[PDB]
């Protein structure tokens, strides 16, 4: 029993079966495209039932070349992808086709991208810190055990080094893995990334899912939910904390927006799919913290117009719980790992679930270089002889304590061999409050650069 | 002295101006989006 | 029960020639019932002569777009087959011809020797088979080339509203490449394709005259696609261009593709989907557009070693509306590119030409596009324009700045005037990194403002003339070498002496 | 054979023909309405075929009194208008009858208005100015001849009075044909230009083509192809330079938006018709002026709602060579004749043809204009007195100008009162030279207003 | 209509006639009305092409 | 609304009920959600007419009762969650006219 | 004029005259405050402010909100009362006193209050 | 209060009863911030508002 094809208008593909055999909805299924030049085996995903047999498909493949009548057959199952440790060190597209070693995984287990976010009784009860051990992010910041992180940047101010730094905590300071979900990825990026993570050596710790821009947009769609499926396998299966990379998903909405665009309905506010909120929940949720290991998320969130009422960034933002915002100004300074103090943010910086010291440190830290970003507009005009001495000294150290929030990543230790340096909590948080109260701003300036702590910023006073 | 207060609150208030406008432009921008698709559908929907 | 199997067999009877017949025709579509095997886009030949493209395939007929020529068809017409999908001609003989979007010559001079057929929709160089963009590909526009680089291999939106200078931008990055071209070298040559959506007549027969006239011509192909002809056309147009590019792409050469404009691409496909009754989107557009661009834009690459090391530079250009770079096909497009110029018609009325908004436009590729002397001699441009740009407002008032402060400006109004450039006149990337470093280093701070485009021309002829040994240097090394600095220095200063400024003061 | 009138529905009927005898696409049928108060010969252009024998037309005059089933009889050519010299000074409408001498041009020659436009191989740029005498279209939107010349406007700015003034100013002493196409202007102004030119003894070198606005939309759709064909044959057929006006020309585009919809065309952006821009690169590129034979085209284009971004005048825009675009900010502060310097362009504006005198003027007068527009935010607040001493010389200098582009027109002589005058190209570039450098800094800015010309000015400042 | 072929009645017999149109704003909607009744897909604003 | 159901139910029974809705905008988005697909035209900002009603018709129902009825009540605390602080929103306009 | 008479009229249009100007600096009151204005404008702005507060009024159905009782100003004290603001005899009191006053004699009272 | 404060945030000086409502005013803002999850019972908010 197998179906045919009776429509094709670009990528949606209606298939009539049997009546006792039309798929269910979200199964994959195999049609060919066999003239010579594209010849391939479409994989199609059910997405509507239109009664008397036919069922409507978006072609997770370009149709160009399907032939009306082409058997179509079901697999029986949704797109179902690899898991297992497997699939460390390999890039993989929406389907689960590895793409750097094509045929590999085929045999590994299999499981659906389509799968249900924790029973309500497994969701932990209470936010946990992740203690990724950088100081900007511990104290400013501080990240979500099981949460999602909004990453802003752009080229040049090292988002890559940054994304590195984090996997190789996350493989080496909790022993977890990390994918990358690269939704609408560029294929440059895409080849950039695979080439940077093989030379830094931390391929082997994350599994690389791409789903390519000139892709139609169902595997645009479904490529943060096969990265995901990964990560829950690394999760539920291997008791592995994992760090789920989705850039960008706003590509992950837009590509929503056009199959539902192209299923024909009817377009929401501002052009947006009317199940928006509902994609992006069933997308989001599934990242969470269950039976004490979590897939945290770092997920770089295109803002349309730079409007953050827009229904993308909206409907996304009700869902992330930190942001960390890269500036080039910062990065200029040479202080990676190039966060911006002030912009960033984060809803865990609370004092009732960060303790009141963190919190107390943390909002002395942005008021001075709250302070001291105010008086940067007279100090590039006037220069800085013309402040007050209160002005002056309070500009030294707010000089030195973001000068401070750079670390020696270990995404560094590929360029200059200087082991990357894990500061613990504590440590960050007492040092910072030394730095507020003046304790250190008799060293020079350059004794904060890329130091990890409080003894290798005596050790580099002393060299200096 | 009066005129280095008088321009700082003069800054603040074109500050808040230009996030009311853009406040603004951008609900014109959905709203502009949203009766453009209406408008579109409606004369697909009567084909 | 026996209802099914028979109905079974029937559709399955359902060598013999294939052959349907018109039933609707309207507005540039025509659906044809019958030809139960036709394949998505493939190439219908209805009776006059004319050509189709099955674009949508329902079961009672395939919807087909006409590629010209559409008043000839009518109902009852005989449509025939042909069993090949969309493909064009390609080989080295398109090089200094105008072709439609079939590969079919226009510009009215005889045949063209087609090497092979590429079909229109063959694969993008995957993951696998790409490499890191490290060649530069020097537009000869002191802006784009110090600022927002392009590496053979990237994706270059330049993107702004109606007469800002996008096509002479992209113009002279075509007339640049008449030097790569001379030395005979396939691993410096980069050829061009000029794809043209939308454009009038007249003004691509401009733009193959501003090419002939510079010698580009003999490196260019025009895959032409004027308002004139019907929407397929228009739609096809970077795909046959992309096409011709690919094949030289995947024979080792460099390629440099020019679409003006995507917009009218997307334009053209949207009448095209409207008209086939395909739902449409935001703006009327398909849901599939996004998807349109991509699938154009990622074929542009930068082939392995293992697949010939050839590349495919696109410069695409797109007419924003109202300088919104919001609208739904500008922001695919940025999406989809690997960086930005933006070009403004406020600079462009305020004498910044070409209009290149710095601070906005930016690359991704960056400083690993470009050579080493312009990575290391345009480095401090960018933050001293930025500089610049904000300490703009206190012009006024500069009595009351800084020392600092006011050398800032003085520098960035320097500058600024440094990244002024005539049209249709692109500088070899020696000639770049002498200009910049006249301003960079601080040799243009003595020369006035209303001069710095003058002492520039002049001086770089100057050196030209007389001390070629130092762009001779900066080309065969690509760095400026310390030695080489001295001794351009010697001759600025011996130079500034001989420089009368229009005002008539002293420039030493 | 006859057809049958089966569906009629405001200007688009549709009409069943025996399955032998389907009238090709473009076609000319001939129904008969005969209530007599509507009694007439309607014209109808097929327009679709939508099988079983039916196509669907439109409507050249009302459908009002049309009758199902009436027979409907096959011309078996498209639309033809006469052409030749005869053509020459008299008024016809979109279908070639002639209005001023009914039963006049019956027995020309023929032409079909349905033709291909000129190869590409017979396209060569034209470079040539076309010195008008106006001071802002001489100086920063200088025409060229043989080229494409456009008057965008929003409603009421002037586009007629401009084109009149056109017309008044190159016409008059052209050698050569005109053929001016009211394409859905107001009848009143054809009226006028209609009795200006028999005044002028310039109708008798003059064919008009009236579609106006009264009409359907089926002749405001074919009177522009009408007019264009008696140009076009003056460009072939007797190579004759050609002056082609046209006003306005989107009604053309405006009409067939009126009848896509009942045509079953999805509907595009801003509810204009999907084939929007391939209708006007058609119409557009028969304008074009081949190699050795000349069409000076000028173009009213209307801007709904003001919108220069609207679908219709964005595609128009990519059509011209020169573009004076006339905006309401401009006209309200009476600067007659309305136009925007800044929005207004010409491709012959490089130094290499209009020279480098003239070039340097009119982008230092842009230059002035641009910055004067900046100022205007901080002037209207902050008040002038606190601008630069540069910056208020430049502001000066900038209104200036503003005033002194203004001219009064012949065509605008019952607007103002006061007669037309014209000011030589060298004139404008020295006085406007004169502005920029300050040399009538010490006239008051209201000397500027409506003189044309240095004369002009010298006398109003004494005036004052 | 009604009020124009009133006053054309008067005009075409040689007087001199003035027309105000109170408010054409109110009946171009009742011709939305009248259109989007009888099922004519709109354009823009929602008003017939 | 089975919120507002388990409430009335002890509302009537003369039981004192406090309703607490995060967040009546989410349900606004999921009966467009709905309404599209079920292709009912859109109106302001997307939302069918019937939002406006959707929202009354839960938010009417928490009312005091009168003693005739047990004297029972049901405090209604729907929260909205504008964007901008936009209190002219639709939906938050909608809501601070219907509480 | 035919109607509510001359005077009654004549106050109105000017209350709106001085109002319609008040909304016309709006955007300059925004940026930079009365203290840039023309001395006329700035006149004009601070009975502007005086007149539109004056236009509130204790309503007696607001009784149950704030508690104060509610006041009803007969017509011809109203075009009284703003006959005497837009002549400026009250632009020395301050804008408080208008505030949800409702009168001439209530006006007195809260400006000895205040 | 709010109003008051953002006068002064800019005005060189006020009379001592504007300086007074500042006060009194900082003070009410102070005393109704709140932590969360701590509810205070009726008579509790009485005497605090006291
Ligand atoms: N660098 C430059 N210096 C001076 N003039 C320039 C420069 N670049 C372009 N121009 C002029 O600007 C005008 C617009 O140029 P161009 O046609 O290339 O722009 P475009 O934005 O691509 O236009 P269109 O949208 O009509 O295709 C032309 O007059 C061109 O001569
Ligand atoms: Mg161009």
Same mark, same amino acid.
């Given at each position: 029993?197998?179906?045919?094809?009776?429509?094709?208008?670009?990528?949606?593909?209606?298939?009539?079966?049997?009546?006792?055999?039309?798929?269910?909805?979200?199964?994959?299924?195999?049609?060919?495209?066999?003239?010579?030049?594209?010849?391939?085996?479409?994989?199609?995903?059910?997405?509507?039932?239109?009664?008397?047999?036919?069922?409507?498909?978006?072609?997770?493949?370009?149709?160009?070349?399907?032939?009306?009548?082409?058997?179509?057959?079901?697999?029986?199952?949704?797109?179902?992808?690899?898991?297992?440790?497997?699939?460390?060190?390999?890039?993989?597209?929406?389907?689960?086709?590895?793409?750097?070693?094509?045929?590999?995984?085929?045999?590994?287990?299999?499981?659906?991208?389509?799968?249900?976010?924790?029973?309500?009784?497994?969701?932990?009860?209470?936010?946990?810190? #992740?203690?990724?051990?950088?100081?900007?992010?511990?104290?400013?910041?501080?990240?979500?055990?099981?949460?999602?992180?909004?990453?802003?940047?752009?080229?040049?101010?090292?988002?890559?080094?940054?994304?590195?730094?984090?996997?190789?905590?996350?493989?080496?300071?909790?022993?977890?893995?990390?994918?990358?979900?690269?939704?609408?990825?560029?294929?440059?990026?895409?080849?950039?990334?695979?080439?940077?993570?093989?030379?830094?050596?931390?391929?082997?710790?994350?599994?690389?899912?791409?789903?390519?821009?000139?892709?139609?947009?169902?595997?645009?769609?479904?490529?943060?939910?096969?990265?995901?499926?990964?990560?829950?396998?690394?999760?539920?299966?291997?008791?592995?904390?994992?760090?789920?990379?989705?850039?960008?998903?706003?590509?992950?909405?837009?590509?929503?927006?056009?199959?539902?665009?192209?299923?024909?309905?009817?377009?929401?506010?501002?052009?947006?799919?009317?199940?928006?909120?509902?994609?992006?929940?069933?997308?989001?949720?599934?990242?969470?913290?269950?039976?004490?290991?979590?897939?945290?998320?770092?997920?770089?969130?295109?803002?349309?117009?730079?409007?953050?009422?827009?229904?993308?960034?909206?409907?996304?933002?009700?869902? #992330?719980?930190?942001?960390?915002?890269?500036?080039?100004?910062?990065?200029?300074?040479?202080?990676?790992?190039?966060?911006?103090?002030?912009?960033?943010?984060?809803?865990?910086?609370?004092?009732?679930?960060?303790?009141?010291?963190?919190?107390?440190?943390?909002?002395?830290?942005?008021?001075?270089?709250?302070?001291?970003?105010?008086?940067?507009?007279?100090?590039?005009?006037?220069?800085?002889?013309? #402040?007050?001495?209160?002005?002056?000294?309070?500009?030294?150290?707010?000089?030195?304590?973001?000068?401070? #929030?750079?670390?020696?990543?270990?995404?560094?230790?590929?360029?200059?061999?200087?082991?990357?340096?894990?500061?613990?909590?504590?440590?960050?948080?007492?040092?910072?409050?030394?730095?507020?109260?003046?304790?250190?701003?008799?060293?020079?300036?350059?004794?904060?650069?890329?130091?990890?702590?409080?003894?290798?910023?005596?050790?580099?006073?002393?060299?200096? | 002295?009066?005129?280095?207060?008088?321009?700082?609150?003069?800054?603040?208030?074109?500050?808040?101006?230009?996030?009311?406008?853009?406040?603004?432009?951008?609900?014109?921008?959905?709203?502009?989006?949203?009766?453009?698709?209406?408008?579109?559908?409606?004369?697909?929907?009567?084909? | 029960?026996?209802?099914?199997?028979?109905?079974?067999?029937?559709?399955?009877?359902?060598?013999?020639?294939?052959?349907?017949?018109?039933?609707?025709?309207?507005?540039?579509?025509?659906?044809?019932?019958?030809?139960?095997?036709?394949?998505?886009?493939?190439?219908?030949?209805?009776?006059?002569?004319?050509?189709?493209?099955?674009?949508?395939?329902?079961?009672?007929?395939?919807?087909?777009?006409?590629?010209?020529?559409?008043?000839?068809?009518?109902?009852?017409?005989?449509?025939?087959?042909?069993?090949?999908?969309?493909?064009?001609?390609?080989?080295?003989?398109?090089?200094?011809?105008?072709?439609?979007?079939?590969?079919?010559?226009?510009?009215?001079?005889?045949?063209?020797?087609?090497?092979?057929?590429?079909?229109?929709?063959?694969?993008?160089?995957?993951?696998?088979?790409?490499?890191?963009?490290?060649?530069?590909?020097?537009?000869?526009?002191?802006?784009?080339?110090?600022?927002?680089?392009?590496?053979?291999?990237?994706?270059?939106?330049?993107?702004?509203?109606?007469?800002?200078?996008?096509?002479?931008?992209?113009?002279?990055?075509?007339?640049?490449?008449?030097?790569?071209?001379?030395?005979?070298?396939?691993?410096?040559?980069?050829?061009?394709?000029?794809?043209?959506?939308?454009?009038?007549?007249?003004?691509?027969?401009?733009?193959?005259?501003?090419?002939?006239?510079?010698?580009?011509?003999?490196?260019?192909?025009?895959?032409?696609?004027?308002?004139?002809?019907?929407?397929?056309?228009?739609?096809?147009?970077?795909?046959?261009?992309?096409?011709?590019?690919?094949?030289?792409?995947?024979?080792?050469?460099?390629?440099?593709?020019?679409?003006?404009?995507?917009?009218?691409?997307?334009?053209?496909?949207?009448?095209?989907?409207?008209?086939?009754?395909?739902?449409?989107?935001?703006?009327?557009?398909?849901?599939?557009?996004?998807?349109?661009?991509?699938?154009?834009?990622?074929?542009?690459?930068?082939?392995?070693?293992?697949?010939?090391?050839?590349?495919?530079?696109?410069?695409?250009?797109?007419?924003?509306?109202?300088?919104?770079?919001?609208?739904?096909?500008?922001?695919?497009?940025?999406?989809?590119?690997?960086?930005?110029?933006?070009?403004?018609?406020?600079?462009?009325?305020?004498?910044?030409?070409?209009?290149?908004?710095?601070?906005?436009?930016?690359?991704?590729?960056?400083?690993?596009?470009?050579?080493?002397?312009?990575?290391?001699?345009?480095?401090?441009?960018?933050?001293?324009?930025?500089?610049?740009?904000?300490?703009?407002?206190?012009?006024?008032?500069?009595?009351?700045?800084?020392?600092?402060?006011?050398?800032?400006?003085?520098?960035?109004?320097?500058?600024?005037?440094?990244?002024?450039?005539?049209?249709?006149?692109?500088?070899?990337?020696?000639?770049?990194?002498?200009?910049?470093?006249?301003?960079?280093?601080?040799?243009?701070?003595?020369?006035?403002?209303?001069?710095?485009?003058?002492?520039?021309?002049?001086?770089?002829?100057?050196?030209?003339?007389?001390?070629?040994?130092?762009?001779?240097?900066?080309?065969?090394?690509?760095?400026?070498?310390?030695?080489?600095?001295?001794?351009?220095?010697?001759?600025?200063?011996?130079?500034?002496?001989?420089?009368?400024?229009?005002?008539?003061?002293?420039?030493?």
């Amino acid at each position: 029993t197998a179906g045919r094809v009776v429509r094709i208008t670009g990528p949606v593909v209606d298939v009539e079966f049997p009546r006792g055999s039309v798929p269910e909805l979200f199964n994959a299924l195999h049609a060919e495209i066999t003239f010579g030049a594209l010849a391939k085996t479409l994989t199609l995903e059910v997405a509507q039932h239109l009664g008397d047999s036919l069922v409507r498909c978006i072609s997770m493949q370009p149709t160009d070349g399907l032939v009306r009548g082409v058997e179509v057959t079901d697999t029986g199952a949704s797109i179902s992808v690899p898991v297992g440790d497997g699939v460390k060190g390999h890039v993989f597209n929406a389907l689960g086709d590895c793409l750097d070693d094509p045929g590999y995984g085929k045999d590994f287990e299999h499981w659906s991208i389509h799968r249900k976010p924790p029973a309500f009784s497994d969701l932990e009860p209470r936010t946990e810190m #992740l203690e990724t051990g950088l100081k900007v992010v511990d104290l400013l910041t501080p990240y979500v055990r099981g949460g999602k992180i909004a990453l802003f940047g752009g080229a040049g101010v090292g988002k890559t080094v940054l994304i590195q730094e984090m996997i190789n905590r996350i493989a080496r300071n909790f022993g977890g893995t990390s994918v990358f979900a690269g939704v609408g990825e560029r294929t440059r990026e895409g080849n950039d990334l695979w080439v940077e993570l093989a030379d830094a050596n931390v391929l082997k710790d994350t599994a690389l899912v791409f789903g390519q821009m000139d892709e139609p947009p169902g595997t645009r769609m479904r490529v943060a939910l096969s990265a995901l499926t990964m990560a829950e396998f690394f999760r539920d299966e291997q008791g592995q904390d994992v760090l789920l990379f989705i850039d960008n998903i706003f590509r992950f909405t837009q590509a929503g927006s056009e199959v539902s665009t192209l299923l024909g309905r009817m377009p929401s506010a501002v052009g947006y799919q009317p199940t928006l909120a509902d994609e992006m929940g069933e997308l989001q949720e599934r990242i969470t913290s269950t039976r004490g290991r979590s897939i945290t998320s770092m997920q770089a969130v295109y803002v349309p117009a730079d409007d953050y009422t827009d229904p993308a960034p909206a409907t996304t933002f009700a869902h #992330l719980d930190a942001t960390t915002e890269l500036s080039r100004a910062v990065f200029s300074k040479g202080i990676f790992p190039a966060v911006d103090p002030l912009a960033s943010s984060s809803t865990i910086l609370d004092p009732a679930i960060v303790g009141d010291e963190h919190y107390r440190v943390a909002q002395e830290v942005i008021r001075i270089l709250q302070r001291y970003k105010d008086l940067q507009d007279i100090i590039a005009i006037l220069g800085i002889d013309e #402040l007050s001495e209160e002005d002056k000294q309070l500009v030294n150290r707010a000089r030195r304590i973001e000068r401070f #929030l750079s670390q020696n990543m270990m995404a560094a230790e590929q360029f200059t061999g200087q082991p990357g340096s894990t500061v613990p909590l504590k440590e960050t948080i007492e040092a910072f409050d030394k730095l507020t109260k003046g304790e250190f701003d008799h060293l020079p300036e350059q004794a904060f650069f890329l130091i990890g702590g409080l003894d290798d910023l005596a050790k580099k006073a002393e060299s200096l | 002295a009066s005129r280095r207060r008088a321009m700082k609150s003069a800054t603040d208030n074109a500050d808040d101006l230009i996030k009311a406008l853009t406040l603004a432009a951008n609900r014109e921008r959905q709203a502009q989006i949203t009766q453009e698709i209406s408008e579109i559908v409606g004369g697909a929907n009567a084909l | 029960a026996d209802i099914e199997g028979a109905i079974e067999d029937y559709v399955s009877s359902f060598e013999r020639e294939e052959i349907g017949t018109v039933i609707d025709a309207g507005d540039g579509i025509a659906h044809v019932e019958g030809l139960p095997s036709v394949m998505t886009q493939e190439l219908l030949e209805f009776p006059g002569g004319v050509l189709g493209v099955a674009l949508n395939l329902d079961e009672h007929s395939v919807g087909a777009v006409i590629l010209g020529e559409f008043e000839k068809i009518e109902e009852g017409q005989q449509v025939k087959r042909t069993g090949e999908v969309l493909s064009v001609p390609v080989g080295d003989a398109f090089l200094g011809r105008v072709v439609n979007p079939l590969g079919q010559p226009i510009d009215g001079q005889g045949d063209i020797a087609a090497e092979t057929r590429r079909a229109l929709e063959l694969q993008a160089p995957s993951v696998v088979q790409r490499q890191s963009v490290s060649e530069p590909l020097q537009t000869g526009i002191k802006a784009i080339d110090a600022m927002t680089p392009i590496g053979r291999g990237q994706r270059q939106l330049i993107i702004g509203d109606r007469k800002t200078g996008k096509t002479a931008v992209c113009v002279d990055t075509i007339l640049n490449q008449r030097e790569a071209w001379l030395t005979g070298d396939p691993k410096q040559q980069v050829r061009c394709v000029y794809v043209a959506i939308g454009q009038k007549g007249t003004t691509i027969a401009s733009v193959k005259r501003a090419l002939e006239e510079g010698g580009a011509m003999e490196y260019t192909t025009i895959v032409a696609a004027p308002a004139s002809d019907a929407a397929g056309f228009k739609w096809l147009a970077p795909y046959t261009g992309s096409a011709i590019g690919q094949h030289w792409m995947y024979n080792g050469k460099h390629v440099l593709i020019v679409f003006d404009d995507l917009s009218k691409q997307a334009d053209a496909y949207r009448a095209i989907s409207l008209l086939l009754r395909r739902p449409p989107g935001r703006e009327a557009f398909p849901g599939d557009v996004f998807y349109l661009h991509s699938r154009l834009l990622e074929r542009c690459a930068k082939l392995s070693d293992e697949l010939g090391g050839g590349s495919m530079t696109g410069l695409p250009i797109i007419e924003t509306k109202a300088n919104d770079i919001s609208a739904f096909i500008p922001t695919n497009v940025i999406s989809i590119t690997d960086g930005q110029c933006f070009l403004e018609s406020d600079l462009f009325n305020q004498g910044v030409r070409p209009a290149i908004n710095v601070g906005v436009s930016v690359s991704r590729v960056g400083g690993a596009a470009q050579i080493k002397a312009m990575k290391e001699v345009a480095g401090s441009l960018r933050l001293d324009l930025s500089q610049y740009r904000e300490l703009e407002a206190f012009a006024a008032f500069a009595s009351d700045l800084d020392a600092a402060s006011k050398a800032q400006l003085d520098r960035g109004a320097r500058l600024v005037e440094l990244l002024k450039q005539p049209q249709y006149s692109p500088l070899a990337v020696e000639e770049q990194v002498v200009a910049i470093f006249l301003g960079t280093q601080g040799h243009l701070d003595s020369v006035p403002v209303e001069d710095v485009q003058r002492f520039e021309s002049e001086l770089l002829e100057h050196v030209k003339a007389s001390h070629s040994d130092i762009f001779d240097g900066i080309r065969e090394t690509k760095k400026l070498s310390e030695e080489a600095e001295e001794k351009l220095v010697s001759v600025i200063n011996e130079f500034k002496k001989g420089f009368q400024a229009s005002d008539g003061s002293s420039v030493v």
